[PDB]
């Protein structure tokens, strides 16, 4: 009859543990609620990949561009302020005949604001392409990159 | 005989509970039909 | 009773159905070996200092078959009149690899 | 009454071990998939590679964009992969030893899903 | 015979109740699982992070003596990326411009000399500076890791003495 | 102008108090600095993954019937 | 016969319950556990290099050797060793041949 006694004691242990857990939960449910509320970030860390957390909702162009020349920068145009330059060409504006003309910024901050703003304002002006070719501008663009 | 009937009744009830709780999360047709 | 055994078999069948439908990729990932993480210092574990004549050399480096001298702080090849005495006073006559140094 | 005990064990197994496991798995992975689909990007840059995800009855499955030679497309081409519709993809479920660091890339692809959750 | 069947039915009923408890998105079940995870993480990291944060607060309060512009965002180059960092006035701890609800906004560089990353970092300093993240206690309470024991990281000691 | 230049210090289960004090101010020796220990009491909640197995325990009473 | 089948079924039960209790069943759990495993590997690899102060023989020139006490910080995630000597930090890349040829005599002459 040893097996019957063992079964009785183990089932009693299970039931008693259930009752102890139930009463402890009943008395400490609020306490564990504030413990979890004040330690919510401790449940799962944001470094599940072994890397620092990255918010995909905030878009950054530098994450994918692996070529420096393809990036847009602000460079000092000699004697005419600052311009936005890249391997594609200068950021331009509409000319008198819907053409492309290099737009020039007074200060570095204005150029940075225009270049890196969330507003899509890309207007390529390649000075080395056949339709619009300028030897001095193309040389300057190739040298400054 | 009674064991079989009781087990089938409880199995059906538990399967119904699980299906009712997990249909919104396992019905992948909703995601496929949505673009 | 045979019906109870059939019920147990049906339950096992349902368990296998659920595991096959849902946890197939998990089981295959469990069966396969783990993912090896590269060790930058693993290839240096067989490196032991042993100097021929008076020039300090490094042996046991596989990817550099030729005898590679030992450089100093200012990147000068090490030539020492008492290299053998220094090595004997450091670890003894028997050569010591980097693995033995790390396990000290 | 060994057989009734076995019936009890297997019933408990299913409905208190496997079905709750399915529940947690599906809830977590469905939330991850919905968060992914909220990005409005067909391919995302994980571990210098382009990963897409799809939701099936077994859960969320990740795939990597590759070219005609089964070489993964770098992230620098992401803009021309999202606009594409017939991208060749390799599923992360099947291990491929020819691609260097494939297991790590698929690992980090699965890990970047669970940012919010 | 009847007692065995009654116990059988009772066990199946308790199994159904436990199944409902587990698969119904219960508040108690969720709180208990969350507590099981959170307690282990807290035991692992909280006190060590607090001690390290106090140490770096002392270090940065020593460092800020005699300097007036140390509490202004400067774009620090971390080798592979830029980070807009200043020194927090209240805690004298490193502070960085945050990216949404994630970590600091690390502006990746495509080469050693990347003017575009520098300029985008300056743009963040001018525009996106309203959201900030601090090493140590704040990072641990917001992201689940402190950053002092992960490398490479802009809060870690190895990345800052390299 | 007073400086302390220690070398390799290695202390175990002890206290190190480098004062380098060179003014009229007197360091508060054996002044026990007590803070508010905002201790968070852990509770004896067994991982609820035990809930199925415990049920199995109850189940084995059917072996004794 | 019946006893063998019942034991086999019970052992299958125990194995499946053990797997579903102590092994990952979704991508979140698998990612968390692999994070923990990789972190443990990195930590033990970093702990292989003795972080306590160690006495070495360091060649300040081609033919001059001096006893010195150094500190080593190993980061295997990026593969670099920072040696604090005379209060100055020297960073050695473990993927560079010259850095290896400079650092290895320092490590192998330690005592």
Question: What is the 3 state secondary structure string of chain C?
Answer: CHHHHHHHHHHHHHHHHHHHHHCCHHHHHHHCCCCCCCCCCHHHCCCEECCECCECEEECCCCCCCCEECECCCCCECECCCHHHHHHHHCCCCCCEHHHHHCC
DSSP structural state of residue D50: E
Of B2, B13, B21, the CB nearest to E24: B21
CA dihedral C69, C73, C78, C84 (to 10 degrees): -100
- Chain E closest-CA separation from residue D23 CA (Å): 6
CB contact under 8 A, D112 and A49: yes
Which of E138, E135, E133, E139 lies closest to E159 in space, CA to CA? Answer: E135
CB contact under 8 A, G105 and C78: yes
CB contact under 8 A, E18 and F47: no
Determine the residue among C41, C88, C89, C98 to mutate to test chain G binding: the one whose Cβ has the most chain G Cβ atoms within 10 Å: C41
Contact G80, G91 (CB under 8 A): yes
CA dihedral E127, E130, E131, E136 (to 10 degrees): 120
Tokens (6 digits) for B14: 């538990």
Contact G90, G107 (CB under 8 A): no
Cα gap G23→G3, rounded to integer Å:
29
Q: Cβ neighbours of residue E104 under 8 Å, at least 6 residues apart?
A: A52, E83, E84, E85, E96, E97, E98, E133, E154
Placement of tokens 């571990």 in the chain: D47
Tell me if there are at least 3 CB pairs under 8 Å linking chains D and A.
Answer: yes
Contact E100, A59 (CB under 8 A): no
Q: Which regions of E50-93 does DSSP assign to beta strands (E)?
A: 74-77, 81-87
Cα gap F57→E11, rounded to integer Å:
11
Which of E98, D11, C74, A98 lies closest to G101 in space, CA to CA? Answer: C74
Cα gap C58→C75, rounded to integer Å:
15
Q: What is the CA radius of gyration of chain D?
A: 19
Cα gap A64→D73, rounded to integer Å:
12
Which of F11, G23, C55 lies closest to D17 in space, CA to CA? Answer: G23
In terms of Cβ atoms closer than 10 Å to its own Cβ (0-12, 13-18, 19+), residue E1 is exposed
Please report the resolution in angstroms. Answer: 3.0
Contact D49, D72 (CB under 8 A): yes
Method: cryo-EM
Which of E125, E131, E135 lies closest to E73 in space, CA to CA? Answer: E125
Contact A85, A72 (CB under 8 A): yes
Placement of tokens 């980097």 in the chain: C98
CB contact under 8 A, F10 and G53: yes
Cα gap C3→C6, rounded to integer Å:
5
CA distances from A139 to A67, A108, A134 (A): 20, 22, 8
Sign of the alpha-carbon torsion through C47, C49, C53, C56: positive
CB atoms within 10 A of CB A105: 20
φ/ψ (deg, to 5) at D44: -115, 155
Neighboring chain D residues of A55 at a CB cutoff of 8 Å: 115
- Chain G closest-CA separation from residue A33 CA (Å): 23
Contact G87, G73 (CB under 8 A): no
Cα gap D5→F59, rounded to integer Å:
7
Which of F64, D7, B9, G6 lies closest to E4 in space, CA to CA? Answer: F64
Name the H helices within chain D: 2-13, 19-37, 78-82, 102-111
Neighboring chain B residues of C4 at a CB cutoff of 8 Å: 3-4
CB contact under 8 A, C19 and D19: no
Neighboring chain A residues of E42 at a CB cutoff of 8 Å: 39, 42
Contact G93, G80 (CB under 8 A): yes
Cα gap D21→E33, rounded to integer Å:
13
Cα gap E28→E22, rounded to integer Å:
10
Cα gap A31→G97, rounded to integer Å:
58
Neighboring chain F residues of D4 at a CB cutoff of 8 Å: 62
Neighboring chain C residues of D57 at a CB cutoff of 8 Å: 21-22
């Amino acid at each position: 009859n040893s097996l019957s006694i063992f079964f009785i004691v183990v089932a009693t242990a299970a039931v008693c543990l259930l009752f102890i857990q139930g009463y402890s939960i009943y008395e400490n449910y609020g306490n564990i609620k504030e413990f979890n509320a004040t330690h919510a970030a401790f449940e799962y860390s944001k470094s599940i990949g072994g890397t620092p957390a990255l918010d995909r909702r905030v878009q950054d162009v530098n994450d994918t561009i692996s070529d420096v020349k393809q990036k847009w920068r602000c460079v000092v145009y000699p004697g005419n302020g600052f311009v936005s330059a890249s391997i594609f060409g200068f950021q331009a504006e509409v000319g008198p005949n819907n053409t492309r003309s290099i737009r020039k910024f007074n200060t570095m901050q204005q150029c940075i604001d225009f270049t890196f703003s969330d507003v899509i304002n890309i207007n390529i002006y390649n000075p080395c392409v056949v339709p619009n070719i300028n030897n001095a501008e193309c040389q300057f663009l190739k040298s400054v990159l | 005989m009674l064991v079989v009937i009781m087990f089938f009744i409880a199995f059906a009830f538990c399967s119904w509970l699980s299906y009712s709780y997990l249909r919104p999360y396992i019905s992948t047709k909703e995601l496929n039909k949505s673009r | 009773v045979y019906k109870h055994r059939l019920i147990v078999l049906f339950e096992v069948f349902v368990v296998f159905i659920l595991i096959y439908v849902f946890f197939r990729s998990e089981l295959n990932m469990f069966f396969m070996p783990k993912r090896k993480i590269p060790d930058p210092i693993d290839r240096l574990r067989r490196a032991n200092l042993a100097c021929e004549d008076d020039k300090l050399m490094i042996y046991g480096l596989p990817w550099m078959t030729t005898q590679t001298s030992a450089l100093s702080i200012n990147s000068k090849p090490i030539v020492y009149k008492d290299c053998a005495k220094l090595l004997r006073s450091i670890n003894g006559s028997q050569p010591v690899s980097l693995n033995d140094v790390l396990r000290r | 009454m060994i057989t009734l005990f076995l019936i009890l064990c297997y019933f408990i197994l299913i409905f208190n071990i496997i079905v709750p496991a399915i529940s947690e798995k599906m809830r977590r992975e469905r939330a991850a998939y919905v968060n992914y689909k909220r990005l409005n990007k067909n391919f995302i840059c994980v571990d210098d590679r382009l990963f897409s995800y799809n939701f099936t009855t077994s859960g969320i499955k990740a795939k990597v964009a590759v070219d005609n030679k089964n070489v993964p497309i770098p992230c620098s081409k992401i803009n021309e992969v999202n606009n594409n519709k017939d991208v060749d993809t390799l599923y992360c479920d099947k291990d491929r030893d020819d691609i260097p660091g494939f297991a790590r890339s698929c690992y980090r692809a699965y890990s970047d899903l669970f940012f919010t959750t | 015979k009847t007692s065995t069947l009654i116990f059988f039915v009772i066990i199946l009923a308790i199994s159904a109740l436990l199944l409902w408890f587990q698969t119904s998105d219960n508040p108690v079940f969720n709180e208990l699982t969350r507590y099981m995870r959170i307690k282990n993480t807290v035991n692992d990291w909280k006190s060590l992070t607090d001690s390290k944060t106090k140490l770096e607060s002392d270090r940065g309060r020593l460092l800020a003596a005699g300097k007036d512009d140390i509490f202004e965002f400067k774009c620090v180059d971390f080798g592979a990326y830029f980070i807009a960092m200043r020194l927090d006035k209240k805690t004298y701890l490193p502070q960085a411009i945050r990216r949404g609800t994630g970590d600091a906004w690390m502006v990746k560089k495509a080469a050693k000399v990347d003017p575009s990353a520098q300029q985008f970092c300056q743009y963040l300093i001018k525009h996106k500076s309203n959201n900030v993240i601090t090493c140590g206690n704040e990072m641990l309470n917001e992201l689940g890791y402190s950053g002092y024991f992960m490398s490479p990281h802009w809060c870690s000691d190895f990345s800052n003495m390299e | 102008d007073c400086t302390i230049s220690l070398g390799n210090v290695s202390i175990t289960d002890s206290k190190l108090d480098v004062n380098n004090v060179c003014d009229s101010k007197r360091v508060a020796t054996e002044n026990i600095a007590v803070r508010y220990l905002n201790q968070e009491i852990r509770y004896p909640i067994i991982d609820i993954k035990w809930l199925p197995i415990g049920l199995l325990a109850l189940a084995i009473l059917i072996l004794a019937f | 016969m019946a006893s063998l089948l019942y034991l086999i079924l019970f052992l299958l039960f125990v194995c499946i319950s053990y797997y579903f209790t102590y092994y990952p069943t979704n991508k979140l759990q698998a990612a968390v556990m692999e994070t923990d495993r990789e972190n443990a590997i990195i930590r033990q690899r970093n702990d292989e290099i003795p972080t306590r102060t160690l006495d070495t023989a360091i060649f300040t020139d081609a033919s001059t050797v001096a006893s010195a006490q150094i500190h080593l910080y190993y980061n295997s995630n990026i593969g670099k060793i920072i040696m604090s000597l005379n209060g100055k930090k020297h960073t050695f890349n473990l993927y560079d041949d010259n850095d290896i040829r400079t650092l290895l005599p320092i490590l192998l002459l330690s005592k």
